[PDB]
Design a protein around this ligand. Structure first.
Ligand SMILES: CCCCCCCCCCC(CCCCCCCCCC)(CO[C@@H]1O[C@H](CO)[C@@H](O[C@H]2O[C@H](CO)[C@@H](O)[C@H](O)[C@H]2O)[C@H](O)[C@H]1O)CO[C@@H]1O[C@H](CO)[C@@H](O[C@H]2O[C@H](CO)[C@@H](O)[C@H](O)[C@H]2O)[C@H](O)[C@H]1O
Ligand SMILES: CCCCCCCCCCC(CCCCCCCCCC)(CO[C@@H]1O[C@H](CO)[C@@H](O[C@H]2O[C@H](CO)[C@@H](O)[C@H](O)[C@H]2O)[C@H](O)[C@H]1O)CO[C@@H]1O[C@H](CO)[C@@H](O[C@H]2O[C@H](CO)[C@@H](O)[C@H](O)[C@H]2O)[C@H](O)[C@H]1O
Ligand SMILES: CCCCCCCC/C=C\CCCCCCCC(=O)SCCNC(=O)CCNC(=O)[C@H](O)C(C)(C)COP(=O)(O)OP(=O)(O)OC[C@H]1O[C@@H](n2cnc3c(N)ncnc32)[C@H](O)[C@@H]1OP(=O)(O)O
Ligand SMILES: CCCCCCCC/C=C\CCCCCCCC(=O)SCCNC(=O)CCNC(=O)[C@H](O)C(C)(C)COP(=O)(O)OP(=O)(O)OC[C@H]1O[C@@H](n2cnc3c(N)ncnc32)[C@H](O)[C@@H]1OP(=O)(O)O
Ligand SMILES: CCCCCCCCCCCCCCCCCC(=O)OC[C@H](COP(=O)(O)OC[C@H](N)C(=O)O)OC(=O)CCCCCCCCCCCCCCCCC
Ligand SMILES: CCCCCCCCCCCCCCCCCC(=O)OC[C@H](COP(=O)(O)OC[C@H](N)C(=O)O)OC(=O)CCCCCCCCCCCCCCCCC
Ligand SMILES: CCCCCCCCCCCCCCCCCC(=O)OC[C@H](COP(=O)(O)OC[C@H](N)C(=O)O)OC(=O)CCCCCCCCCCCCCCCCC
Ligand SMILES: CCCCCCCCCCCCCCCCCC(=O)OC[C@H](COP(=O)(O)OC[C@H](N)C(=O)O)OC(=O)CCCCCCCCCCCCCCCCC
Ligand SMILES: CCCCCCCC/C=C\CCCCCCCC(=O)O[C@@H](COC(=O)CCCCCCCCCCCCCCC)COP(=O)([O-])OCC[N+](C)(C)C
Ligand SMILES: CCCCCCCC/C=C\CCCCCCCC(=O)O[C@@H](COC(=O)CCCCCCCCCCCCCCC)COP(=O)([O-])OCC[N+](C)(C)C
Lengths: 404, 404
């Protein structure tokens, strides 16, 4: 019975092991967060929720609507929605010329982009956090209407040669189901879930509330005191002081962005999809396992990646153009939308976001051409800390100092 | 081109996805620890390492050896090692009766267990942290010598009917290579690595030093102030106060035990195995992914599990006994060794460790019969926080209060 029991192996944590199953770490983080903050979350939940008076605020908005510009914009987006729908319904039956339809759709999209920006920059009575919601609603509406017109154009061009054909997909039910759906690519037959899971909805709502409380606590107890150490704007300040102050904020800002990602792309979108019985719930991929910046940029946001691939990248390639030109176009569009979403709601136009997005390129080349394995993943995790979140934190800090 | 792109799926974080690859979380923890504590680690490393004078302490021990009982015990363990080796070498050639050899081996093992305990309980000049090292060395020596005599007995009984046979494996080189090897199961041919990786050794030493500094910082900045809030012993204290105080210490104690596991079972053992070119490096398995307490107890420590299975469990089953009796025997041996390793170095004999190990049973039954999936893993992670680490923390706290 002298037989052997040892054999060449390697410990699980070592990179040469090829081990990947680490769900226990996630469950540990959840258990630690709950054990540490459950009493405070319950206290704050009772305190705030005992003041829940939605009828009060609804009536208040109903007494004077012209004093709340952000919900008025979120409501007026439906005018552009109905305009695009009417253009499409006339294009199907009505013999409206395709060039006229294209021109009207381009006008509708340009107005969708330009109207909220004008109303925000001109009306000084709108808060810089409802302005962001209005601008996000209008950006999402712009992308969704682009996809809508594109898919309907494809189906129309096809028609010249349990399931729904082309002309019977133009209804307000389908259009509005698409407008509220957690996706930016239009289809005629969406995949559906069998039923609404109430425990799933409850857990998602609890996650949303808990991470909201956690983010407010993080901000008000870690970043506001650190900012109030020396309240000066980042503009008109030596680079040494800028870096010295950003070193104290890089970590809590990173945690805030992580909580943003989780409670926005996992819990909120799954709650919406569960309420709507939406089938496809692939809203993200393993960006945390990225070994280069390009993998992270592709896999951190799947809706926008699908949109860029299906309506912006591949149509541009099919018309004849090098991949470099299409990548440059995507880069410029992303920079423009970063500006649209950051500078406009704050009315603060600096060169920080642009140079951040620019310096993101040689960093990507370096991480791709020098690091590999777990060191590439560490370099990506480090680039997330001193990358674009810093360029947004500078804006938010300068605004909080200049305006309070 | 109206074809579809959506399909029924589920987000990666949801338990219904079946996703497991989460190495990015580990790399994130490492990057965060480094970014947060690198300056302090470098400062403390410079400060302490500029005092490195090993020749000084070696000479000091050489001037008066009778004043340092712990290294004298760690040195005197070699006497028992050589005694067992001589018994075996005489059993091979020398016609020593097998019953006499068995009796001498039993006497040697009983002395291995009883001598350090007596020297510790009788000599009051030994520190309660060198006492633990001596007791651990003698426990490990006891287990290793048990395995040695068992394997040699198997090979001898077989003999009555690149590679090494039985009689040519009895040498001081092989015995001492086994004694320093990170394993408790003896073999005649160990698997070997091809070469010593210097970068691997450097990273393991750096991990050891870094986690040592981190643990000292955790203790001296989180648990010593919390203890000094009201310095009273856990004995002669109301249960309400006991639980109220343990609630403030459950978390840092858990983090301390996690760092213990990592820097002891991964970095230290891999450094030793790399210095010795040891092949098998499976020192642990995915205990963090456990869905019941039994899986965790089996997979958290692979050396002791292999020992219990190969020399204690299976030999007991082959002689005829129900599985319940063997499990009870393992439980009693583990309780005895917990006492031997905790109570003796502190000279403090209470009923806390025994009732902790006892209450571990109905907790295991409950977690097995009620929870499943990620909830079982959460229950196991919660049982690790209020389980045995608490029963060791009570001992250490009472000692630190009573003695300083
Ligand atoms: C993994 C990372 C672990 C980091 C832990 C940091 C703990 C922390 C965040 C508070 C979180 C509140 C959460 C509420 C949740 C509610 C639901 C406690 O934050 C402390 O909270 C105290 C009040 O409780 C307050 O007094 C302190 O000023 C504040 O630092 C910040 O601690 C320290 O704050 C310092 C400020 O300069 C900062 O320098 C330190 O680097 C930081 O370590
Ligand atoms: C994931 C969990 C994250 C928990 C973070 C806790 C940060 C922490 C541990 C210090 C760690 C030092 C490591 C040194 C490594 C060296 C290599 C900082 O610890 C603080 O260190 C300060 C000095 O820097 C000291 O002053 C404070 O008293 C001490 O709390 C403890 O913070 C707070 O301490 C409080 C004491 O009552 C405690 O109540 C709070 O609950 C705890 O949040
Ligand atoms: C917005 C809300 C945010 C909430 C909080 C989120 C937290 C996230 C969590 C944690 C990180 C912290 C936050 C870090 C980041 C913060 C950034 C902001 O917040 S800015 C704010 C404003 N928003 C933007 O400015 C848009 C940002 N970008 C995006 O949303 C997308 O990720 C985007 C637009 C970048 C996706 O675009 P693509 O990179 O997928 O596009 P293509 O270039 O077409 O990629 C396809 C790739 O495949 C290759 N390819 C080649 N042949 C192909 C083929 N046949 N088919 C497909 N691909 C092909 C192509 O060459 C390309 O790869 P090749 O770049 O060259 O390496
Ligand atoms: C020591 C240094 C620690 C440093 C820090 C570590 C940190 C760790 C990290 C994080 C957690 C925090 C710390 C929590 C824990 C702290 C506890 C202490 O520190 S106490 C201190 C003193 N030491 C002890 O008292 C020993 C503790 N125990 C151990 O070391 C082992 O894990 C031990 C002895 C429990 C392993 O024994 P088995 O459970 O493997 O033994 P069997 O019962 O034979 O298991 C085999 C199983 O397979 C089944 N089986 C059935 N047929 C089989 C067959 N044919 N072959 C094999 N198995 C079979 C058997 O029925 C059994 O499973 P069925 O229990 O019934 O569910
Ligand atoms: C769902 C279950 C929720 C249980 C909540 C129990 C009440 C809250 C509670 O005890 O908080 C206390 C701790 C949380 O530790 P952390 O904030 O450092 O604590 C140190 C802090 N400064 C303190 O002194 O409090 O709490 C803990 O550390 C709890 C650890 C043991 C939990 C045992 C639960 C089962 C019984
Ligand atoms: C580690 C954490 C810190 C990472 C790097 C941060 C660099 C900050 C830095 O040097 O900003 C520098 C500029 C900000 O100039 P702005 O006020 O017009 O001009 C400065 C003006 N002349 C002044 O007097 O103050 O800022 C920029 O040009 C861009 C700001 C950083 C954007 C992200 C860079 C990632 C690499
Ligand atoms: C290996 C690289 C090691 C880099 C160490 C840099 C010096 C140390 C350093 O900057 O510490 C500062 C922070 C560590 O944050 P944490 O302790 O909360 O910080 C808050 C703390 N109370 C503080 O005010 O400091 O440090 C940080 O948060 C660092 C974040 C940016 C790191 C950028 C590295 C590449 C350039
Ligand atoms: C959540 C964190 C806390 C988990 C449970 C901790 C229970 C602590 C508790 O109640 O201890 C109670 C006992 C300690 O008695 P001891 O001093 O002889 O006797 C008490 C004596 N009569 C006195 O006057 O004080 O202690 C025991 O009997 C065992 C102590 C706990 C061991 C681990 C239990 C895990 C379940
Ligand atoms: C900058 C340098 C690079 C930084 C990134 C790391 C890359 C290198 C690497 O993988 O190192 C090592 C991994 O290292 C670990 O596994 C450490 C994880 C520690 C986590 C905390 C204790 C977990 C205890 C347990 C979990 C409990 C739950 C904990 C929950 C928090 C492996 O690298 P290597 O084998 O030396 O290299 C081979 C080539
Ligand atoms: C007690 C109750 C049980 C507690 C354990 C959880 C079990 C339930 C569960 O799996 O919930 C959910 C997972 O939940 C998550 O994935 C949350 C992870 C949050 C980590 C922090 C943000 C990570 C951002 C990103 C990472 C960046 C790195 C972050 C590094 C820290 C899933 O459960 P469910 O789908 O609702 O249930 C289906 C049935």
């Amino acid at each position: 019975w002298e037989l052997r029991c040892h054999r060449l192996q390697d410990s699980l944590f070592s990179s040469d092991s090829g081990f990947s199953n680490y769900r226990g770490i996630l469950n540990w983080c959840v258990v630690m967060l709950i054990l540490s903050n459950a009493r405070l979350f319950l206290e704050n939940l009772i305190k705030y929720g005992i003041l829940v008076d939605p009828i009060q605020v609804v009536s208040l908005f109903l007494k004077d609507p012209y004093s709340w510009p952000a919900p008025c914009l979120v409501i007026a987006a439906n005018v552009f929605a109905v305009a695009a729908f009417q253009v499409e319904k006339r294009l199907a039956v009505g013999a409206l010329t395709e060039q006229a339809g294209l021109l009207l759709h381009v006008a509708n999209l340009a107005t969708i982009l330009c109207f909220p920006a004008a109303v925000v920059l001109l009306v000084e009575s709108i808060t810089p956090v409802g302005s962001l919601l209005a601008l996000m609603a209008h950006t999402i509406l712009f992308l969704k209407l682009f996809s809508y017109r594109d898919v309907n154009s494809w189906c129309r061009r096809a028609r010249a040669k349990h399931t729904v054909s082309y002309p019977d997909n133009l209804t307000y039910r389908d259009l509005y189901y698409f407008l509220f759906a957690p996706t930016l690519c239009y289809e005629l037959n969406f995949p559906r879930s069998p039923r609404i899971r109430k425990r799933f909805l409850l857990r998602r709502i609890l996650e949303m509330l808990f991470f909201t409380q956690l983010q407010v606590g993080l901000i008000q107890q870690w970043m506001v005191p650190t900012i109030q150490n020396s309240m000066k704007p980042f503009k008109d300040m030596d680079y040494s002081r800028i870096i010295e102050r950003l070193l104290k904020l890089a970590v809590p800002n990173h945690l805030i962005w992580l909580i943003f990602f989780y409670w926005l792309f996992h819990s909120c979108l799954n709650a919406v999809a569960e309420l709507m019985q939406f089938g496809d719930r692939e809203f993200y991929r393993d960006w945390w396992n990225s070994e280069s910046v390009t993998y992270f940029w592709q896999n951190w946001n799947i809706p926008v990646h699908k949109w860029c691939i299906r309506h912006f990248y591949k149509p541009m390639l099919r018309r004849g153009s090098s991949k470099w030109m299409a990548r440059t176009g995507v880069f410029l569009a992303s920079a423009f939308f970063h500006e649209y979403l950051v500078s406009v709601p704050l009315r603060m136009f600096r060169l920080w976001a642009f140079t951040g997005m620019m310096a993101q390129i040689p960093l990507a080349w370096f991480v791709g051409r020098f690091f590999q394995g777990n060191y590439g993943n560490a370099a990506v995790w480090l680039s997330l800390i001193i990358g674009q979140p810093i360029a947004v934190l500078m804006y938010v800090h300068d605004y909080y100092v200049l305006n309070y």
